[PDB]
Amino acid sequence: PNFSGNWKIIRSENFEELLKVLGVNVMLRKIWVAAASKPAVEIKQEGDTFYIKVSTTVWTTEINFKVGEEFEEQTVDGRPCKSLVKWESENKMVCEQKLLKGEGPKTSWTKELTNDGELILTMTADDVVCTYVFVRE
Ligand SMILES: *C/C=C(C)/C=C/C=C(C)/C=C/C1=C(C)CCCC1(C)C
């Protein structure tokens, strides 16, 4: 259970479907998936304090949290939400998100390290689950 490393993608699933539920319309979804279905992820872990950097070609997102401590970040479609992370096993954590403003689909994410050394990220919007699978560089 050391999440730390520089992670690269081997697999991704249902990302466009996720964006549809989030209300991103067609041309935008098609364009987006043709250059954001290969983001890089960097994690530095310090106990249950996490630093996560997620980057495409021209955009980067910085997430900082302690497990069990409320913080702020964005939904996938760039919307301000309150977040809370909890452990579900030794190698898996879960985040529940609430919008600061307005209404929208219920969103969440999970992070899991397999024993094979795969980092599995899921993002969920109502009934849709998008899964990204990473290995270490
Ligand atoms: C523990 C790992 C976490 C919290 C990683 C979360 C990653 C995302 C929320 C990625 C979001 C993306 C966008 C917001 C737009 C570009 C496509 C993604 C998947 C990189």
UniProtKB/Swiss-Prot annotation:
InterPro entries: Calycin, Fatty_acid-bd, ILBP, Lipocln_cytosolic_FA-bd_dom. Interacts with RXR and RARA. Interacts with importin alpha. Transports retinoic acid to the nucleus. Regulates the access of retinoic acid to the nuclear retinoic acid receptors. Sumoylated in response to retinoic acid binding, sumoylation is critical for dissociation from ER and subsequent nuclear translocation. Induction: By retinoic acid. It is found in: Cytoplasm; Endoplasmic reticulum; Nucleus. This is Cellular retinoic acid-binding protein 2. A motif (Nuclear localization signal) lies at residues 20-30. Gene3D superfamilies: 2.40.128.20. It comes from Homo sapiens (Human). It comes from the Eukaryota. GO terms for cellular component: cytoplasm; cytosol; endoplasmic reticulum; extracellular exosome; nucleoplasm; nucleus.
